[model samples]
Target: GLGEEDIPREPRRIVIHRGSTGLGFNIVGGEDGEGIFISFILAGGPADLSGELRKGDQILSVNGVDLRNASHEQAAIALKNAGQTVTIIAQYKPEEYSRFEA
Candidate 1:
């Protein structure tokens, strides 16, 4: 049998461990258009090890914090306060989607 594919277009749920510096990645959002997004997946860091977390993924929640529709600076605070092995949620809106053609 073939491997299962990601057919649904929804948010992703992920749990990421932090480094000494904590959650070795950056988040950006509350922009002119987009709501919340991820940035700067630190190289060789904890987030980098995960490989799934990356730039452009919208931050849904972090350790139960509602980061979906908040200020960039404010949402960042939530992440900064995230404790060990925090579970987070996100959605990746890539450059394009094949579903658009259908």
Candidate 2:
């Protein structure tokens, strides 16, 4: 059920660059499933101020659609049609900064 109408006006700011599960460095999860994660680095914009978008962050949903059940194109289309400032649900590792540990 693909259509031009589903295509968004703008390109998706975030994208999923799923890591491979074959290698030992692969993330712990279903290897046969989709690997698309989330990214803030767009063509020409800053999605996150501090770059909270990590490499392994899982994109749970976009706008309201669950990407886990949706195809990569479908998820991307939703984000594109969402105009600007899209809300994304993602899971990432906690940020731990080492300050004056001295």
Candidate 3:
């Protein structure tokens, strides 16, 4: 299940300079009406080298375009069309019980 509590405090911005194969990370939309999340990061990929992206992180935008409600295919198209360089703003989804109470 998903909840508002799962949303992180702020988004993370990642810049990927396009190689011959693109950004090197795979993304997918949430299954149960959640936002788009990073499904996989290819080894030695641009994103992997940056060490900033991670699986299950929610993608908020692509190159400043909001993707909060975009479908998986739409987000993929955005990345594909970004051309040469891509900037992704994302947030890591928090675990249901991972937060500590004061």
Top candidate when judged by lDDT against the true structure: 3
CA shift at 99, candidate 1, in angstroms? Answer: 18
Off by over 4 Å in 3: 1-4, 30-32, 96-102
lDDT of 3 by residue, 1-100 (tens): 5465455557788898887788888876634465787878999989899899988677889999888888777888888998787889988874622321
Candidate 3: clashing pairs of residues: none
- TM-score versus the correct structure, for each prediction: 0.77, 0.48, 0.82
lDDT of 1: 0.72
Global lDDT of each model?
Answer: 0.72, 0.43, 0.77
Top TM-score: which candidate number? Answer: 3
Candidate 3: clashing residue pairs, number: 0
Q: Tell me which of candidates 1 and 3 scores higher on TM-score.
A: 3
Instruction: Tell me how candidate 3 scores on lDDT.
Output: 0.77
Residue lDDT tens for model 1, 3-60: 1454445888888887898887886556554556776788888888988887767777
The regions of model 2 sitting more than 4 angstroms off are: 1-32, 39-44, 48-50, 93-102
